[PDB]
Design a binder for this molecule. Structure first.
Ligand SMILES: Nc1nc2c(ncn2[C@@H]2O[C@H](COP(=O)(O)OP(=O)(O)OP(=O)(O)O)[C@@H](O)[C@H]2O)c(=O)[nH]1
Ligand SMILES: [Mg+2]
Ligand SMILES: [Mg+2]
Lengths: 63, 97, 125, 285, 65
RNA sequence: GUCCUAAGGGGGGCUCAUGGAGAACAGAAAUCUCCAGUAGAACAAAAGGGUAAAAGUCCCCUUGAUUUUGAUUUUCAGUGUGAAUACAAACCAUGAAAGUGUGGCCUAUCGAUCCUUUAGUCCCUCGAAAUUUGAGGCUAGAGGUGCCAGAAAAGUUACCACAGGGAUGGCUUGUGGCGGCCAAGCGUUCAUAGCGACGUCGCUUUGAUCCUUCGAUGUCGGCUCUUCCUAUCAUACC
RNA sequence: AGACCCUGUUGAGCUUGACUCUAGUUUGACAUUGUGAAAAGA
RNA sequence: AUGGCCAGAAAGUGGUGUUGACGCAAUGUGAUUUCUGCCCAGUGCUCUGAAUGUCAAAGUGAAGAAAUUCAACCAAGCGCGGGUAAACGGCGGGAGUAACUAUGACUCUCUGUAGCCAAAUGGAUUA
RNA sequence: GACUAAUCGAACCAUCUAGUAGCUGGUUACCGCCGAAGUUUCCCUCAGGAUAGCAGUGUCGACCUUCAGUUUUAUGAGGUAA
């Protein structure tokens, strides 16, 4: 929300999640949304493609 | 706000850029650069040309004494008169406000 | 009430009569929203009965424009100039610079960075 | 405004965010004594660059009607007026009149003491260069009254008169003339206007020793009739416009020393006390 | 300059996107528009930041930003 | 109906309308000379004190017709290297200089065979007759989108259906681009300009670093099996 | 004579402050609706 | 129950209903375990709370010889002004004040190699 | 969007009905005399129009006047070679 306020001039901000396999990027996105919006599995490489999830009006999350 | 400014604010009409509103254009047929308006502008193209094509019906409907060489100046005078009436209306409205 | 018709909505919202409208305007759709959603529906050319394109699609105009540059005095002047005092102030500022993790960069200032940043080490040079 | 010159004059007389230096109009009534004319000449000499002078007789009583003053402000674009008068009740009067929007903002009368008035030419010293703004010193207890009065308005008009042109920098050689106005609370108090030249002398210290020498003119006034501004006009005159180069401070937005725009993010205190760890099988004895 | 980028899982595909086929300059502090609202596509492999500039008088070629 | 290297800006020089006296045509009124001429002329505004070695009028220079930068002001931006805008700075023009000055002004659109409105008393008709209101026809006028009315009939079908129409090439290969120089030669030799192979010169780590992989609209395969080309990896010879 | 693409004065199904309607609902008036009193007035 | 939900062209018409809130009807979610990011009040939900501001039909008053015209009056809904399922939705915090109520506005600064606490467990890594 | 007699995003039967199509397919003996054309001009375009021009049958008028995608003469443009 603070980053969105700092970029209030733009229409929205994109927040992309990076890291090692099986660290919990899709789990973090699902937790922030409060709903299972991204696929989650304990095996590495469950997420294979980039995915947009609209968290709020001006916050997008990129898995 | 004038009538145009209010209408543009309602319709989302964006102001033209300074590069877009320049009094300069490239004429392909002559291969030269010329002005759109003003002295020797594109709005008065052919008033000094040696030969002008004239339609027979247009010449028949043309009043006596007038020629084809002043039609563009007539149209400019009409447009200037309309723009002047509109800006006088805007100034009167702003004076009442 | 007044009525759920579009004209009744226009008089209820008090828009100045005689104004043009974009096709598809309603209570849920403004002109900007209709343009945004019609962008997604763009991309189809207009064709005749034989499939020949009579009107090209958006940004596929196929006509060659006259790519010419006008003579202008602005092309031969310096667009950006900087003074020695300003350069010295920027050098002192960059020497004074300290990194803070809780600050973010929102807009970079267009500066002649090669004349401001310090030189490399003499061993490397 | 058909011509470019008339357009330039209209744009100069147009209202602006930062204003032009105010112009002072020096004019006299039908009766004006020689002492009053000499005082007007001295004030014009103090303010040559931003003043205009009338030379005819004007049958105007400023406290009865000021329509002609408003007309003169309209025509000459003058925001200060020094009006000279002479009468049996008031022998030598200088009426300081300040405009706002080509209408009279406020007015104040000064009565001259004739036996003590000294012109600039009667002092045999070096004089001020043309265009140099003199510094100002206001002394006494009459200027800090809690209620706005005639002395406070006289101070405001004298500041606006000897203000000159604003400047963010000044040469150290342009600190050589001072104008001192002295007035005390109390039978009528006397406002004394003096001008001095400044000499600097070595004192064995980095700060120089300032010595004064009288420059002229020597004026003694008694404050007279008083026209206070309208309240709404006073707030409209005391509205302060904002320069476009003066930025508005945005929350958590700043500019660093290199001109980069910097945002501030705030994390907050890390409170992990209420986090319950996972109760694994290996963590149980 | 622009080529149609077709999107959709049907046989009939939406064609509103365009891609610039010539090198582009995007400038500093560039963040790409999101894919739902990105009509014009300027690929990263075609973005240039420096150029070999020749001075006609000095007869010197320098790579400049 | 014509004419203009446009307006504007800067600098320099001169003084105007008018009156008197004079000069072949020239005679109230042509042109020229002197004297007197606070502007009584011209240029702008609407002074109750605008301008006289000028703000008037002629010469010289620019005419580049709307410059660049900005983390700043206001507004806007599904095309966010931001755009318009205000302000500031730089640039520019002129001048010996002090300085001066510019880097725009505006506006929704549509009808004129249209809309609104007025008059006809001695105009005609209301069909059984007359009068008074009213309505229609015809004629003559006035104004011009502030007070001349009005200008709001959307999508989707991957659930589908019908009537039809369709499904560059004797190209390519092994050697970069831009800019300058040299250059045998081609030309030229009342102009000494212009092309130019062969080349060359500038931009694109002391055997390193490995902590900079830079976007599917375009789609390939696998099996079995036959043949062809050489631009030959191997075997053969040099 | 499948599928796919393109065209139509295209047909049909579905949706929505698209247009005109309408079932239903709500509100007002009139008739069904008669008989007396007690006051306030014109 | 002089009720709701329906059906019927209508009906002295039918169903729920041989029914009566532990019921009937309509929704969303979908065992158990877990579970309700923080705060409101813009859209919407509902308040007979004052108004006639919009205000049809019928009715009332005036002008004319009438056709006709003009005026008040004018229900519901809308509008205005209040509380919310606070559902949708918007909302980076925390302090002050000069505003004084909505909207404020103007400054300041903000980053245990296995524990504690909760009625054995701390789970959704659910048999 | 499944089923409702092999028929279902609206069953079957008969009628209005020979519904409509600008789209598709087809359109039946012989010989003779002529015989074509693609911005010429105007209109808001595509899902557009007329219109000029070129043609065939009849006639009529004194089928009277004659005219002509040609040259020459003279004068223009091209004064351009020479
Ligand atoms: N205990 C515990 N487990 C977690 C947490 N976050 C994620 N996990 C587990 O870690 C696993 C891997 O994370 P993912 O959801 O697959 O996300 P990821 O890191 O992007 O993995 P990939 O999609 O394969 O790249 C998940 O199955 C979760 O069960 C956590 O905070 N605590
Ligand atoms: Mg995983
Ligand atoms: Mg993942």
């Amino acid at each position: 929300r603070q980053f969105s306020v700092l970029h209030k001039d733009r229409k929205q901000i994109s927040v992309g999640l990076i890291g090692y396999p099986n660290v919990g990027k899709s789990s973090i996105i699902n937790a922030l949304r409060g709903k299972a919006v991204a696929k989650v599995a304990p095996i590495p490489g469950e997420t294979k493609v980039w995915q947009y999830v609209t968290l709020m009006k001006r916050i997008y999350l990129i898995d | 706000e004038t009538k145009w400014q209010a209408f543009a604010r309602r319709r989302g009409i964006k102001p033209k850029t300074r590069e877009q509103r320049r009094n300069l254009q490239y004429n392909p047929t002559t291969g030269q650069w010329e002005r759109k308006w003003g002295y020797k502008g594109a709005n008065k193209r052919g008033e000094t040309d040696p030969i002008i094509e004239v339609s027979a019906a247009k010449e028949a409907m043309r009043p006596e004494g007038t020629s084809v060489r002043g039609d563009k100046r007539r149209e400019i005078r009409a447009r200037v008169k309309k723009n002047q009436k509109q800006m006088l209306r805007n100034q009167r409205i702003a004076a009442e406000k | 009430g007044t009525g759920k018709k579009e004209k009744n909505r226009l008089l209820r919202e008090g828009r100045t009569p005689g104004d043009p409208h974009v096709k598809g305007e309603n209570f849920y759709r403004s002109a900007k929203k209709i343009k945004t959603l019609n962008i997604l529906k763009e991309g189809k050319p207009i064709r005749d009965s034989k499939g020949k394109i009579v009107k090209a699609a958006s940004f596929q105009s196929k006509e060659v424009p006259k790519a010419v540059i006008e003579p202008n005095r602005k092309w031969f002047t310096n667009t950006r100039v900087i003074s020695q005092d300003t350069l010295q102030s920027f050098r002192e500022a960059m020497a004074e610079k300290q990194k803070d993790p809780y600050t973010v960069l929102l807009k970079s200032n267009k500066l002649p960075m090669s004349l401001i940043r310090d030189g490399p080490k003499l061993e490397d040079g | 405004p058909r011509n470019a010159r008339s357009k330039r004059a209209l744009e100069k007389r147009a209202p602006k965010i930062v204003e032009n230096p105010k112009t002072c109009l020096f004019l006299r009534g039908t009766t004006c004594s020689q002492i009053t004319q000499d005082a007007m000449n001295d004030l014009y000499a103090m303010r040559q660059v931003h003043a205009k002078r009338f030379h005819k007789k004007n049958a105007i009583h400023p406290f009865e009607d000021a329509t002609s003053l408003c007309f003169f402000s309209e025509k000459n674009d003058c925001s200060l007026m020094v009006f000279g008068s002479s009468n049996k009740k008031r022998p030598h009067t200088l009426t300081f009149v300040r405009m706002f929007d080509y209408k009279v903002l406020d007015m104040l009368e000064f009565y001259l003491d004739p036996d003590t008035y000294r012109s600039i030419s009667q002092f045999k010293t070096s004089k001020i260069p043309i265009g140099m703004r003199p510094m100002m010193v206001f002394a006494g207890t009459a200027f800090e009254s809690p209620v706005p009065n005639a002395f406070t308005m006289a101070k405001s008009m004298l500041i606006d008169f000897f203000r000159g042109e604003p400047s963010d920098k000044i040469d150290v050689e342009g600190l050589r003339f001072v104008v001192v106005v002295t007035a005390d609370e109390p039978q009528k108090p006397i406002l004394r206007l003096r001008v001095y030249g400044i000499r600097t002398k070595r004192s064995g210290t980095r700060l120089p020793r300032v010595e004064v020498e009288e420059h002229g003119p020597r004026m003694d006034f008694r404050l007279g009739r008083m026209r206070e501004p309208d309240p709404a006009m006073l707030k409209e005159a005391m509205k302060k416009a904002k320069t476009p180069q003066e930025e508005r401070t945005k929350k958590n937005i700043s500019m660093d020393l290199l001109g980069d725009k910097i945002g501030r993010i705030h994390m907050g205190k890390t409170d992990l006390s209420k986090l319950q760890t996972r109760k694994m099988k290996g963590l149980k004895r | 300059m622009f080529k149609v980028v077709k999107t959709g899982k049907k046989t009939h595909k939406k064609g509103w996107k365009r891609i610039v086929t010539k090198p582009t300059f995007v400038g500093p502090d560039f963040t790409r528009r999101p894919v739902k609202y990105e009509r014009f596509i300027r690929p990263m492999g075609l973005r240039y930041k420096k150029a070999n500039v020749t001075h006609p008088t000095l007869n010197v070629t320098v790579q400049l930003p």
